[PDB]
């Protein structure tokens, strides 16, 4: 009876603190910035071979190798320049939802509705790809995973928690609690000190890896948050939701900067990404295509319109010369 | 091109061959999703994710039981959904109706037919005959209901259980008829804990579903 009023007073204090800093908007300082113009991108490669919906995709650090996962139960490594296949990896379960590629190029990870994250070793003397470890402990399904190094990985699940794992022993070293709903997406900072997580409670949190504490909580969306990307300099969020809106958050002004929306878009958003310089923001929709946004102006610079079903995957290479997309029509396309 | 690139191309071609080989076996199995509440008797209708397999007349089926807002999206390619309701617990039928409405009107399931099992009929018969609890206590509109003239009761059945069964089945069928517009169909059935025929019913309904798809493909409907 006494504590709810204290919580409301603290929330009002935070709300009043945030309003004091809103002395300008992006829409006014960018009045002196030229538009990017019209951007045309064309298909350069088509990658064929999957027999089911594609759910996950990830680039390597050398900008040629690519990993993808689908409901046919197989995980494929592609050579983007020649379209040759390098490996084909069977999965023990076909209900896969995420995959990731190690920054050193030695390992690959995946997981799904089996509540387990599985790690594969790509470099053996026998010539085969083998399973190295199974990480158990979550109670919901596994929604996203990313490597920090060869021995540390972060996972997010549908049981409202996040975890940091020690791959050598298979034990959970930090558990991150504080959400009230299912957790969808993670994005790891370039300096590998902080990560950001979205959830079905329409909020986003900033976590400190080394201590296990929540530092900030952001709000504003009206429905589930499906995707998060992390601006290159380490100080901004890009988030997308089922309410057909994208938003840009700042960690130092601790409030929203710009909203990306249009009257003709009434479907949800599946994927969000940036280019190297941060000028373009790429987004996937249920309207069977992908839009190109001007991150500093909230205009629409272009569109990619080559798929016959939902776009589920979107990614950009480390050298910035290519974009890959994936759909439920079982195809991948390389754009430039 | 270099000899090493030709060897890489041969490896890629062999991988494509083996990917094509595996797909042929996958298409020969029909996949089913099983949903239902506790106490409904899900586990007995054909007796992270639990699985079961069974075969009738040389056609294989694969049924999945998970454990609903998010994981449901990946089950939009299944042939049919099986939904099981306990028909002998009057307090919790409104929950079953609300769940049925939430599954019928889901935007990711707009082309999937539902096979509906109304379970535990013997307990309903015993309770209606005993008369210690009445439907009118929870459903006032039952006081005005009459058994239709085209009813086909099983011989020997008391004409107070047929009224209850048809009222309960009407309550579920009425939701399905309000929306859908011909793209997907509901298939009601009455069952009990001791029945064994349940496997054949699924086979017949699946054959009907595939027949409807083939008729639509040929510009006949």
């Amino acid at each position: 009876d006494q504590l709810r009023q204290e919580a409301e007073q603290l929330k009002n204090q935070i709300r009043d603190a945030r309003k004091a800093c809103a002395d300008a908007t992006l829409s006014q300082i960018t009045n002196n910035i030229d538009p990017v113009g019209r951007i045309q991108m064309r298909t350069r490669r088509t990658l064929r071979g999957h027999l089911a919906k594609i759910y996950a995709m990830h680039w390597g650090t050398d900008s040629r190798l690519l990993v993808s996962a689908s409901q046919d139960g197989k995980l494929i490594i592609w050579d983007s320049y020649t379209t040759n296949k390098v490996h084909a990896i069977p999965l023990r379960s076909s209900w896969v939802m995420t995959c990731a590629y190690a920054p050193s190029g030695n390992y690959v990870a995946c997981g799904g509705l089996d509540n387990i994250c599985s790690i594969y070793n790509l470099k053996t003397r026998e010539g085969n790809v083998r399973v190295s470890r199974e990480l158990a402990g979550h109670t919901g399904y596994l929604s996203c995973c990313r490597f920090l190094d060869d021995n540390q990985i972060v996972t997010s699940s549908g049981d409202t928690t996040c975890a940091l794992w020690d791959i050598e022993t298979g034990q959970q070293t930090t558990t991150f609690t504080g959400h009230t709903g299912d957790v969808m997406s993670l994005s790891l900072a370039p300096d590998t000190r902080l990560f950001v997580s979205g959830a079905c409670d329409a909020s986003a949190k900033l976590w400190d890896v080394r201590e296990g504490m929540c530092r900030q909580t952001f709000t504003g969306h009206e429905s589930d948050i499906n995707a998060i990307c992390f601006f290159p300099n380490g100080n901004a969020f890009a988030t997308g939701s089922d309410d057909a809106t994208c938003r840009l958050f700042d960690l130092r002004a601790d409030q929203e900067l710009m909203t990306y929306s249009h009257d003709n878009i009434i479907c949800g958003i599946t994927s969000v990404s940036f280019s190297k310089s941060g000028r373009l923001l790429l987004a996937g929709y249920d309207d069977f295509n992908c839009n190109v946004w001007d991150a500093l102006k909230a205009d629409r610079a272009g569109v990619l319109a080559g798929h016959d079903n939902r776009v589920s995957c979107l990614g950009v290479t480390d050298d910035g010369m290519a974009v890959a997309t994936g759909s439920w029509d079982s195809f991948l396309k390389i754009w430039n | 091109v270099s000899a090493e690139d030709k060897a890489a191309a041969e490896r890629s071609k062999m991988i494509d061959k083996n990917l094509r080989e595996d797909g042929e076996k996958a298409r020969r199995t029909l996949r089913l999703l099983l949903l239902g509440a506790d106490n409904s008797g899900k586990s007995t209708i054909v007796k992270g994710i639990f699985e079961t397999k069974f075969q009738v007349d040389k056609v294989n089926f694969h049924m999945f039981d998970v454990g609903r807002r998010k994981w449901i999206q990946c089950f939009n390619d299944v042939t049919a959904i099986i939904f099981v309701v306990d028909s002998s617990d009057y307090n919790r039928l409104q929950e079953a109706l609300n769940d049925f409405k939430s599954i019928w009107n889901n935007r990711w399931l707009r082309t999937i037919s539902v096979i509906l099992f109304l379970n535990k009929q013997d307990l309903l018969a015993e309770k209606v005959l005993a008369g210690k609890s009445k439907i009118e206590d929870y459903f006032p509109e039952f006081a005005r209901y009459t058994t239709p003239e085209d009813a086909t009761p099983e011989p020997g059945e008391d004409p107070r259980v047929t009224r209850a069964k048809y009222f309960i089945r009407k309550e579920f069928v009425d939701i399905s008829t309000a929306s859908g517009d011909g793209r997907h169909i509901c298939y009601p059935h009455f069952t009990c804990a001791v029945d064994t025929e349940n496997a054949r019913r699924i086979f017949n309904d699946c054959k009907d579903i595939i027949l409807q798809m083939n008729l639509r493909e040929y510009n006949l409907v």
Partner: single-chain antibody
């Protein structure tokens, strides 16, 4: 990872004999295989090659019509059938494992070998016969008749070491990639038609004959060999 060769012995000119190799410890069906020959006073020579799926077969220009290479995946054995043997066929025969995909190491493991007793090409040139020489720096050179640099950015040069009583061991592939298990004392470089190998600090285990091989076009060719005498 183990490869064992069998067969061999003494034959008369005009006869025939068949060799076999038994593989274990790895996915035999995923690798391509080579036969390489060494004569007492000649160095190494390439003989034949069979692809992993038995798709393609190549032969040397001195053995076409006389030698036949075959594969048996379910039993993990290779065979080489030889007919109409000549005096020039007396030599040591080695079995070599190879796999090709982006980033692989195609000549990593060599067998032990067996003995047989009877009774346009790119030229790779090495010329010093012996380098006299612990703790000193040594540089060994090779030179080719045609450029080994392909338009895709790769240059196809390989280095091998043969210690006394041992099979050749892979050191460097594609001119600069240090093979697994090798200490970081070895390095290599070059451009176009001239190549060098550098050893930063010698030990007692760095004594033997060093070979160069090119892998642009078939037939495969080797150099004469440079002997390092400590």
């Amino acid at each position: 990872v183990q490869l064992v060769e069998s067969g061999g012995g003494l034959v008369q000119p005009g006869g025939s004999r068949k060799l076999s190799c038994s593989a274990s410890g790895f996915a035999f069906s995923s690798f391509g295989m080579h036969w390489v020959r060494q004569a007492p006073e000649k160095g190494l020579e390439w003989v034949a090659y069979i692809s992993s799926g038995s798709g393609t077969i190549y032969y040397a220009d001195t053995v076409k019509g006389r030698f036949t290479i075959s594969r048996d995946d379910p039993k993990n054995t290779l065979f080489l059938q030889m007919t109409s043997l000549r005096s020039e066929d007396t030599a040591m025969y080695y079995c070599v494992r190879s796999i090709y995909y982006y980033g692989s190491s195609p000549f990593d493991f060599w067998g032990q070998g067996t003995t047989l007793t009877v009774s346009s090409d790119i030229v790779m040139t090495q010329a010093t016969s012996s380098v006299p020489v612990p703790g000193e720096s040594v540089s060994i050179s090779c030179r080719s008749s045609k450029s080994l640099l392909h338009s895709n950015g790769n240059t196809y040069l390989y280095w091998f070491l043969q210690r006394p009583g041992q099979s050749p061991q892979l050191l460097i592939y594609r001119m600069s990639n240090l093979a697994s298990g090798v200490p970081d004392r070895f390095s290599g470089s070059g451009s176009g038609t001239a190549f060098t190998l550098t050893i930063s600090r010698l030990e007692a285990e760095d004594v033997g004959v060093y070979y160069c091989m090119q892998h642009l076009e078939y037939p495969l060719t080797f150099g004469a060999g440079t002997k390092l005498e400590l």
